[PDB]
With several copies, the nearest count.
Chain A
Amino acid sequence: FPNNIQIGGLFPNQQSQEHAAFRFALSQLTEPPKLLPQIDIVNISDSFEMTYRFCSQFSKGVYAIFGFYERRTVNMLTSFCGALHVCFITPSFPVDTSNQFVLQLRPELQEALISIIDHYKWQTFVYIYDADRGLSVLQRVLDTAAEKNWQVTAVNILTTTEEGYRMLFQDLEKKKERLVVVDCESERLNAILGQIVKLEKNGIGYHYILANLGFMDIDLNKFKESGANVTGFQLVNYTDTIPARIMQQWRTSDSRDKRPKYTSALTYDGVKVMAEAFQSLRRQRIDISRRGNAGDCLANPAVPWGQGIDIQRALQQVRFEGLTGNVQFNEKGRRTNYTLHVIEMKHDGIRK
């Protein structure tokens, strides 16, 4: 197959760990195919800007797309991917309703969170959720709360102010036992941690849970002294042989030119996913060709790309032991058969 297999990319910031990891991982690509990054810097929230960029990449004839999406523009993107039969790789938050052309390289924590809450004798607790797509995980809880009969006092951070936190915590500490779940983004978690450090983070019967796939990245140093419990999840193991070699090589190369966030790790893994699919396609000798028509995305009717279906199957079929874990995909197009590491942080203790 041709080595000019142009691939797209939608990113919010030119300089960031995620972008740097995506740029680096391509260097390791020694496969006969040559994948082009073809990055476009686009604001995620604005759906119009994104539709412009996605149609531009359609004009270029891009075979596959990698990028991020937020709550506002998940639907829009998803819709275009199921209509033009064009695949879209992403490490962003996973969604319940989606096409088969959207490959989400982020296993869902909703199931595991339920198990962890179940194991501990949790009778009542407070839930803190970010509106940034966390709602899918809220319903699950509210649905399991009825089946299993615990009380959940949800509070939203997006529409909560300092006074809101003050009142919530004041009403919370009136209870003898204090249990809290904190679903948040990567950056919102740091600000909320700062908020709780100011007060109400004493550690007097306070038990926090952090529904973030990456718990080592977060700076919980302030929590190692106050004597408070916190439980979290990890998806990436740095000690294992493949992660150790990958981290050593990558950090040595970068220094010759810290620990990556889980988002950056998934970004790096996605390059491997796309490369594996295209390597297997070249090996399987499948006829892939891009017509120069480059029809406008807003073509009435928009004929699906004939080959784009098989690509999807190929991208779904790939399987390998990547950095984060073993990479696999369900029929719906979501990570399957993976492992998470439960991790409690004691005053001086990181216990798996």
Chain B
Amino acid sequence: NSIQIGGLFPRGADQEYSAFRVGMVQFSTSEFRLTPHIDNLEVANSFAVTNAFCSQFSRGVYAIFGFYDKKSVNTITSFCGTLHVSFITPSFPTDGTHPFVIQMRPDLKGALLSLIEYYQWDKFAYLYDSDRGLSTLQAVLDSAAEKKWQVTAINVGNINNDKKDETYRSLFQDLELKKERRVILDCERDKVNDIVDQVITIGKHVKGYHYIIANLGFTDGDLLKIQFGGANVSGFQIVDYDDSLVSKFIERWSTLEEKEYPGAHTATIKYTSALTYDAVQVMTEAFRNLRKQRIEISRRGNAGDCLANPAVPWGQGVEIERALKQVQVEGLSGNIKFDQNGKRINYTINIMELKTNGPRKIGYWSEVDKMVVTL
């Protein structure tokens, strides 16, 4: 039983679509499947997002997988709320309780603020990118007010690539006057690399320094540069490579034709792709649960247009959203459970350090228990 599906993918994201296709083949079955209609665009152009969302809505899509950026959150969430159309994302979780939006990415503030307390930090810088909102920045500042921390928050997201070299050096020159030996690099993979490649040049990767990479993908970057400098490097990873499902997936991943699955050959997998794969699993589980439960989901006719006065949402969307939120399965990221709001719960965020041998896990973190330490 084919169920129509929609897909949005940011321009220049090759690995994620490949993981989407791999998840399709893995979870596809004779009795059930998915028919995805794909669109590629610049997710930071709300106009393009609106056009794609409306086109897919006209194409009678029951749910829409996709990504979004800080300049397209509100458009997407409003459209989903008005049209009662679901949305499944591995992108940053909303700073709110927006409905009809399932979020596959776990929050990070809890683990970050626990880790900063497992190290007894009082005076640290906080380099942040102007993306995925400033929710974690605000959390850090608030906990500073409570705990009398000394935070130097600096933005690096408005730096021109052409003149990148001059600014970073002056930034660290400023930080040196305060003896800022501790830093939190709250940025995506690319800018973390572009910064680590300028800590090295100025020799600030040495015994004295400590870096915390506030990202759910720690290995994703290039850490072979700083393994040996002598400086600490801490971070978080949801994809545990010492697991069974993960190892089997890697067996299927490395043995992949990069001519067909770009990014697939490498042994590493980025958390966005992992969450995309788990998202395919989520959709299949929810839709198959609907089929078993006999819930009636079918578009008898045509959804005229996204823009229609008055807006007339089709009333089976609540069923789809409830099914998507009411699914409990294991996957690459770990255990996937949702709330009535869509945010994930009952998840474990493994913590990692950098050692000359390589990254090694030292503990984990769960919302219920605490920061937990094993090694």
Q: Which residues of A are interface residues toward B (Cβ below 8 A)?
A: 46-49, 51-52, 55-56, 72-73, 75-76, 78-80, 83, 135, 139, 142-143, 145-147, 151, 153-156, 159, 168, 171, 297-298, 300, 302
B70: chain A residues at CB < 8 Å are 75
B78: chain A residues at CB < 8 Å are 46-49, 72
- The stretch from B46-54, B238-246, B345-353 touching chain A is B46-54
Q: A155-B142, A156-B138, A159-B138 are in contact. List 7 more A-B contacts (CB 8 A).
A: A47-B79, A49-B78, A78-B46, A79-B71, A139-B130, A297-B307, A298-B54
A51-B307 contact, Cβ under 8 Å, with A73-B74, A75-B46, A79-B46: yes
In the complex, which residues 43-83 of chain B have their Cβ closer than 8 Å to any Cβ of chain A?
Answer: 45-47, 50-51, 54-55, 70-72, 74-75, 78-79, 81-82
B192: chain A residues at CB < 8 Å are none
Residues of B in contact, count (CB < 8 Å): 33
Q: Decide: A47 and B75 in contact? CB cutoff 8 A.
A: yes
- B155: which of A76, A139, A298 is its contact (CB, 8 Å)? A139
A78: chain B residues at CB < 8 Å are 46
Measured CB to CB, the nearest residue on chain A to B72 is A75
The contact sample of 28 A-B pairs, CB cut-off 8 A, is A47-B79, A48-B78, A48-B81, A48-B82, A48-B311, A49-B82, A51-B75, A51-B307, A52-B309, A56-B309, A72-B78, A75-B46, A78-B46, A79-B45, A80-B47, A83-B47, A143-B154, A143-B155, A146-B152, A146-B174, A151-B150, A153-B144, A156-B138, A156-B142, A168-B145, A171-B145, A298-B55, A298-B307
Q: B113 contacts the other chain (Cβ, under 8 Å)?
A: no
A52: chain B residues at CB < 8 Å are 307, 309
Interface flags for B284-325 (1: CB within 8 Å of A; 0: not) read 000000000000000000000011010100000000000000
Q: Decide: B145 and A147 in contact? CB cutoff 8 A.
A: no
B72: chain A residues at CB < 8 Å are 75
Q: Decide: A153 and B145 in contact? CB cutoff 8 A.
A: yes
6 smallest CB-CB distances across A and B, nearest first, come from A79-B46, A47-B78, A75-B71, A48-B78, A72-B74, A48-B82
**Cβ of B8 to closest chain A Cβ, rounded Å:** 15
Most A Cβ at <10 Å: residue of B54, B152, B153: B153
B311: chain A residues at CB < 8 Å are 48
Q: B34 contacts the other chain (Cβ, under 8 Å)?
A: no
Q: B141 contacts the other chain (Cβ, under 8 Å)?
A: yes
**Cβ of A303 to closest chain B Cβ, rounded Å:** 13
Q: B134 contacts the other chain (Cβ, under 8 Å)?
A: yes
How many inter-chain residue pairs (CB < 8 Å) link A and B? 79
Q: Decide: B154 and A80 in contact? CB cutoff 8 A.
A: no
In the complex, which residues 4-47 of chain B have their Cβ closer than 8 Å to any Cβ of chain A?
Answer: 45-47
**Cβ of A159 to closest chain B Cβ, rounded Å:** 8
A155-B145 contact, Cβ under 8 Å, with A48-B82, A80-B46: yes
B54: chain A residues at CB < 8 Å are 298
Measured CB to CB, the nearest residue on chain B to A171 is B145
Measured CB to CB, the nearest residue on chain B to A46 is B78
**Cβ of A14 to closest chain B Cβ, rounded Å:** 18
Measured CB to CB, the nearest residue on chain A to B141 is A154
A147: chain B residues at CB < 8 Å are 174
Q: Decide: B74 and A75 in contact? CB cutoff 8 A.
A: yes
Measured CB to CB, the nearest residue on chain A to B175 is A146
Q: Decide: A146 and B154 in contact? CB cutoff 8 A.
A: yes
In the complex, which residues 81-118 of chain B have their Cβ closer than 8 Å to any Cβ of chain A?
Answer: 81-82
Measured CB to CB, the nearest residue on chain A to B51 is A298
Measured CB to CB, the nearest residue on chain A to B46 is A79
Most B Cβ at <10 Å: residue of A80, A146, A153: A146
Q: Decide: B141 and A76 in contact? CB cutoff 8 A.
A: no
Q: Decide: A300 and B142 in contact? CB cutoff 8 A.
A: no
A298-B141 contact, Cβ under 8 Å, with A47-B78, A48-B79, A75-B72: no
A153: chain B residues at CB < 8 Å are 144-145
B138: chain A residues at CB < 8 Å are 154, 156, 159
In the complex, which residues 223-245 of chain B have their Cβ closer than 8 Å to any Cβ of chain A?
Answer: none
B47: chain A residues at CB < 8 Å are 79-80, 83, 302
Measured CB to CB, the nearest residue on chain A to B309 is A52
Measured CB to CB, the nearest residue on chain B to A139 is B155
Measured CB to CB, the nearest residue on chain A to B134 is A135
**Cβ of B167 to closest chain A Cβ, rounded Å:** 12
A51: chain B residues at CB < 8 Å are 50, 75, 307
A300: chain B residues at CB < 8 Å are 51, 55
Measured CB to CB, the nearest residue on chain B to A50 is B78
In the complex, which residues 143-158 of chain B have their Cβ closer than 8 Å to any Cβ of chain A?
Answer: 144-145, 150, 152-155
B46: chain A residues at CB < 8 Å are 75-76, 78-80
A76-B307 contact, Cβ under 8 Å, with A51-B50, A147-B174, A155-B145: no
A55: chain B residues at CB < 8 Å are 307
B141: chain A residues at CB < 8 Å are 154
Most A Cβ at <10 Å: residue of B71, B81, B144, B307: B307
B130: chain A residues at CB < 8 Å are 139
B154: chain A residues at CB < 8 Å are 142-143, 146
A47-B142 contact, Cβ under 8 Å, with A79-B46, A80-B46, A146-B152: no
In the complex, which residues 257-302 of chain B have their Cβ closer than 8 Å to any Cβ of chain A?
Answer: none
Measured CB to CB, the nearest residue on chain A to B311 is A48
A75-B155 contact, Cβ under 8 Å, with A52-B307, A80-B46: no
A76: chain B residues at CB < 8 Å are 46, 50, 74-75
**Cβ of B46 to closest chain A Cβ, rounded Å:** 4
**Cβ of A12 to closest chain B Cβ, rounded Å:** 16
B82: chain A residues at CB < 8 Å are 46, 48-49
